[PDB]
Write a protein that binds this ligand. Structure first.
Ligand SMILES: *[C@@H]1O[C@H](CO)[C@@H](O[C@@H]2O[C@H](CO)[C@@H](O)[C@H](O)[C@H]2NC(C)=O)[C@H](O)[C@H]1NC(C)=O
Ligand SMILES: *[C@@H]1O[C@H](CO)[C@@H](O[C@@H]2O[C@H](CO)[C@@H](O)[C@H](O)[C@H]2NC(C)=O)[C@H](O)[C@H]1NC(C)=O
Ligand SMILES: *[C@@H]1O[C@H](CO)[C@@H](O[C@@H]2O[C@H](CO)[C@@H](O)[C@H](O)[C@H]2NC(C)=O)[C@H](O)[C@H]1NC(C)=O
Ligand SMILES: *[C@@H]1O[C@H](CO)[C@@H](O[C@@H]2O[C@H](CO)[C@@H](O)[C@H](O)[C@H]2NC(C)=O)[C@H](O)[C@H]1NC(C)=O
Ligand code: NAG
Ligand code: NAG
Ligand code: NAG
Ligand code: NAG
Lengths: 123, 49, 113, 197, 50
């Protein structure tokens, strides 16, 4: 039937691997193995990773809001990604905020302009 | 002429055309086989009693 | 040039840019102005003087704990509200949120002196 | 699976030029990644998620059809709820279940036919709820701070003054807004209602 | 922002916009100012005083 993908920390760090089974609902078979660490996502059943309640910025995306990373003794973990910092503005009909100072900021932007030119002799 | 044949034309417009590759032709051939002196046993294979 | 397009030439208000070359491409350095420290001031749509309604010409009416001033929108530099900083249109009956305060006329002391 | 489904002999022959399978996968992966990038560039402009303010009088301006409806299980605005109900997707959810394709033979479900021939649809990285949150943050910011929101810190401003600046921007002296504030707010509210219909 | 580009953010003079989410895309609500009733007046490039 199908649906298999592999989540890999780089091999120059570790060889722990988590495997996602896209068409499996563990809430547990048609998998190669279990071994606990079974977490159901909407993108498939993820086996070999520890789900945590700590939302973080995304590193290795999985799908449907779930993203993985390798961390503390370190193992593969999964979490729902943060979308941004929580913030809040006041709203009032008689109050205005006005800048009193400023910053000069310089940022960079990088764009490709040209591609390597090639030529082929078919013979 | 190579450019003219490529373009199927007897007229070539100003510009640069690619014209294949520089090629080198062989001048002689080399044949190397192991220095085997015996004839195969055709008699034994086909003339057996 | 100088762009007025939001986020086109970097974040903040664009002032200027400088190109640098790179293999197969271009790198831009975008210099922008970013508002920094800020303060909370009371505001109002208009100042009522003698029954006439005064609007700022190039700014916003801003009040500290006791007094009204007019400032440029992007920087807190208070000015005295005068007949040179405001323009008059209509009376004090229509605008919602009108406050009183007074509007200074620079000519009156000259006529008196 | 598409070419040699369940055939050992075919697979062994496919291997005589299987470097082509690799390139097909490489190309599709590049697309799949790009599609999440596109979503993020359009919506994740602001990484500061501003809470949608309580609805209070904004000076006669009614934003209830564009802001999230808290009574819903998914906090879509009334307009978004309509947009989502109108666009039809082929299926929903990314879990198909071998057991369900095996059981329901009679439906001849196209999605199962695709799955059995090696054709898979992958989930998006951001969910609809995540997209709705970015949209809500952008609206919350716009309403309380106008454009200062994008430029740097969000600087609170009365909504009607935000409009006054927008009027001076197009080239109409601001006194026009203040004198016609009720008219303007009423036309605005009317226009939004017409769009949902 | 607010844009000066003609018809970029909708027909008429642009005042403001509000995004809405949709499956596989984005829907923008663009609020613009449109001149309505109008009158024809006599004009001149300048006034001659003294
Ligand atoms: C609002 O601004 C005014 C003007 O700067 C402040 O009033 C002045 O305060 C200084 C002392 O710091 C006095 O010497 C001046 O004579 C005052 N001017 C006037 C017109 O009264 C005022 O204190 C500020 N208000 C608040 C609450 O800080
Ligand atoms: C600005 O000053 C005027 C007076 O010059 C105030 O107007 C009076 O308001 C009271 C409210 O109880 C009425 O009973 C009077 O009849 C009004 N008098 C006149 C001449 O209009 C006005 O309220 C003040 N506005 C502010 C914002 O302080
Ligand atoms: C914004 O406009 C809507 C109408 O489009 C108002 O909703 C109505 O509110 C009344 C009073 O609670 C209810 O009886 C109606 O059934 C509501 N109609 C709909 C279609 O929901 C809404 O109250 C207005 N909001 C603001 C802040 O002005
Ligand atoms: C400018 O146009 C508006 C919009 O058509 C006019 O306001 C309408 O006036 C009629 C007649 O009094 C009312 O029945 C409508 O309910 C009003 N519409 C709204 C949204 O309030 C306005 O009178 C026109 N003239 C101006 C500003 O001088
Ligand atoms: C797994 O099955 C349960 C029970 O039918 C259901 O509630 C749950 O949503 C399913 N999981 C996924 C990821 O669809
Ligand atoms: C087989 O033997 C005959 C003589 O009886 C001879 O003439 C013939 O050439 C031989 N064949 C081979 C392949 O040596
Ligand atoms: C402005 O007022 C809001 C609401 O009371 C407050 O949260 C904020 O810290 C104040 N700050 C400034 C100008 O820094
Ligand atoms: C601002 O809102 C308060 C209610 O919180 C109200 O009493 C006051 O009159 C309003 N002022 C203006 C100018 O709308």
């Amino acid at each position: 039937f199908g649906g298999v993908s592999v989540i890999t920390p780089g091999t120059n760090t570790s060889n722990q691997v988590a495997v996602l089974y896209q068409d499996v609902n563990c809430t547990t078979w048609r998998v190669y193995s279990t071994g606990s660490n079974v977490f159901q996502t909407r993108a498939g059943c993820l086996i070999g990773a520890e789900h945590v309640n700590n939302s973080y910025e995304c590193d290795i995306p999985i799908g449907a809001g779930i993203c993985a990373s390798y961390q503390t003794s370190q193992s593969i973990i999964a979490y729902t990604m943060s979308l941004g910092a929580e913030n809040s503005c006041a709203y009032s009909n008689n109050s205005i905020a006005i800048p009193t100072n400023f910053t000069i900021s310089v940022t960079t932007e990088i764009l490709p302009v040209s591609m390597t030119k090639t030529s082929v002799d078919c013979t | 002429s190579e450019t003219k044949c490529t373009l199927k034309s007897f007229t070539v417009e100003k510009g640069i055309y690619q014209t294949s590759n520089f090629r080198v032709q062989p001048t002689e051939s080399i044949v190397r086989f192991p220095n085997i002196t015996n004839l195969c046993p055709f008699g034994e294979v086909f003339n057996a009693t | 040039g100088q762009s007025k397009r939001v986020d086109f030439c970097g974040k903040g208000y664009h002032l200027m840019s400088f190109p640098q070359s790179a293999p197969h491409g271009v790198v831009f350095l975008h210099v922008t102005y970013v508002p920094a420290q800020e303060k909370n001031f009371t505001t109002a749509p208009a100042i009522c003087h003698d029954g006439k309604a005064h609007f700022p010409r190039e700014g916003v009416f801003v009040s500290n704990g006791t007094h009204w001033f007019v400032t440029q929108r992007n920087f807190y530099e208070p000015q005295i509200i005068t007949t040179d900083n405001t323009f008059v249109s209509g009376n004090c009956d229509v605008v919602i949120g009108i406050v009183n305060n007074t509007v200074y006329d620079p000519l009156q002391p000259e006529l008196d002196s | 699976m598409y070419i040699c489904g369940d055939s050992t002999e075919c697979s062994n022959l496919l291997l005589q030029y299987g470097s082509f399978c690799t390139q097909l996968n490489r190309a599709l992966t590049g697309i799949a990644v790009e599609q999440d990038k596109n979503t993020q560039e359009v919506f994740a402009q602001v990484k500061q998620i501003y809470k949608t303010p309580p609805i209070k009088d904004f000076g006669g301006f009614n934003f209830s059809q564009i802001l999230p409806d808290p009574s819903k299980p998914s906090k879509r605005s009334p307009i978004e709820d309509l947009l989502f109900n109108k666009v039809t997707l082929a299926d929903a959810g990314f879990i198909k279940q071998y057991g369900d394709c095996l059981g329901d033979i009679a439906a001849r479900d196209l999605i199962c036919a695709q799955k059995f021939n090696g054709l898979t649809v992958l989930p998006p990285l951001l969910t609809d709820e995540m997209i709705a949150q970015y949209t809500s943050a952008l609206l919350a910011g716009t309403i309380c701070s106008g454009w200062t929101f994008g430029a740097g810190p969000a600087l609170q401003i009365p909504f009607p003054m935000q409009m006054a600046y927008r009027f001076n921007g197009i080239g109409v002296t601001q006194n026009v807004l203040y004198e016609n504030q009720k008219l303007i707010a009423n036309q605005f509210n009317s226009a939004i209602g017409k769009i949902q219909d």
